[PDB]
Design a protein around this ligand. Structure first.
Ligand SMILES: Nc1nc2c(ncn2[C@H]2C[C@H](O)[C@@H](COP(=O)(O)OP(=O)(O)OP(=O)(O)O)O2)c(=O)[nH]1
Ligand SMILES: [Ca+2]
Ligand SMILES: [Ca+2]
Ligand SMILES: [Ca+2]
Length: 341
DNA sequence: GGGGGAAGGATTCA
DNA sequence: CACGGAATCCTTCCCCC
């Protein structure tokens, strides 16, 4: 198997540049303005000019402002980025039927029976890059290896605007040298549990009793890590399909007042339905974010599809159930639909 | 004992 | 001060043969 992974560079910020070239060169910060107060909200991402000073995805807009008060701040326009993304995805399809769209800016191509050895794979990388850059003026980073995981690791290593191959030889090498935290799917929580077990590199998962590892991080995560340790990871490139659709909004102020909360909720329902289009869900969950930034939810699955009418009243109950099972005020309210017919 | 879901949360990544 | 969107996995509770 020969996997070629593509990851678009500082994607949202780069799209804003393509659409408004005068922005290129200076720091650009794409933000999610929550509407609470003046600059309430977080950063979705920022171009590298901005990252040089620590402004990156996830930090409060206010903190970014302190660092770069003169940077350009733009509201996130998700739908725009999506269409450009879709176009780039259609271009990659011209390189392989076997394609797995992982996110708005990521894709795995199974180019096994489309090229032999890594030399040809790499060159397919350059072609793909060059093509995308000429067709959409978007630079991306390419990662190539024997499976999705090391292909993605390949890309993380070459960012930004790069291309890299991790051949059968380096795969073996990284299994012994690569900090396990750098492995896709190992976040802060899992990294710490591994540390406390003494597991620092993929290789270490091989000398520990499975049941031990299993008990601390889960059977799934344990098999995953060992699988990679034994160069036995080979998940196929497959098409993914949306499984849930929803919306969540930040209220103007915290509240436990049903009447005060409902309009935001209903708004969340209306928007979610528009995004559902032809899809009919059988499950609905009401999601609330407490005053202390905590997340609580209540849902329900029906034996049939849910009409918008059924969503409204059912979602009101769930919200009442949330309020009557958690004393904290609510800060953000939303809904999610799943189990599509 | 264990097959088969469903509900609420944990964790991760974009 | 702390955004939106979403997938997979885990524990727990049920119903039943
Ligand atoms: N709203 C929101 N969107 C995010 C967040 N993180 C990532 N995104 C979106 C916008 C990013 O441009 C896009 C791609 O994510 P990456 O994790 O690939 O970041 P980006 O491509 O901007 O930079 P990169 O060159 O990959 O290091 O996903 C986030 O924390 N909040
Ligand atoms: Ca990216
Ligand atoms: Ca990405
Ligand atoms: Ca990590």
């Amino acid at each position: 198997m020969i996997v070629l992974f593509v990851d678009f560079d500082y994607f949202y910020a780069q799209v804003e540049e393509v659409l408004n070239p005068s922005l290129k060169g200076k720091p650009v910060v794409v933000c999610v303005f929550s509407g609470r107060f003046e600059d309430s909200g977080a950063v979705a991402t920022a171009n590298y000019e901005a990252r040089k000073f620590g402004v990156k995805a996830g930090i409060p807009i206010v903190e970014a402002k302190k660092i770069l008060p003169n940077a350009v701040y733009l509201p996130m326009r998700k739908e725009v980025y999506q269409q450009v993304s879709s176009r780039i995805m259609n271009l990659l399809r011209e390189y392989s039927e076997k394609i797995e769209i992982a996110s708005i800016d990521e894709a795995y191509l199974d180019i096994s029976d489309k090229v032999r050895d890594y030399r040809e794979a790499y060159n397919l990388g350059l072609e793909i890059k060059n093509k995308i850059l000429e067709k959409e003026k978007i630079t991306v980073t390419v990662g190539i290896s024997k499976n999705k995981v090391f292909a993605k690791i390949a890309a993380d290593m070459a960012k930004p605007n790069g291309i890299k191959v991790i051949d059968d030889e380096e795969v073996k090498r990284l299994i012994r040298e690569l900090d396990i935290a750098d492995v896709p799917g190992i976040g802060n929580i899992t990294a710490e549990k591994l540390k406390k077990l003494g597991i620092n590199k993929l290789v270490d998962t091989l000398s520990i009793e499975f049941d031990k590892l299993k008990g601390m991080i889960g059977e799934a995560k344990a098999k995953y890590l060992i699988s990679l340790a034994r160069d036995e990871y080979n998940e196929p490139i497959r098409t993914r399909v949306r499984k849930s659709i929803g919306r969540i909004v930040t209220m103007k102020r915290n509240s436990r007042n049903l009447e005060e909360i409902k309009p935001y909720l209903f708004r969340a329902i209306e928007e979610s339905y528009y995004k559902l289009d032809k899809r009919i869900p059988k499950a609905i969950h009401v999601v609330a974010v407490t005053e202390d930034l905590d997340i609580v939810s209540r849902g329900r699955t029906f034996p049939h599809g849910i009409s918008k009418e059924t969503a409204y009243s059912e979602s009101v109950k769930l919200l009442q159930k949330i309020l009557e099972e958690d004393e904290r005020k609510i800060r953000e309210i939303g809904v999610r639909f799943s189990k599509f017919i």
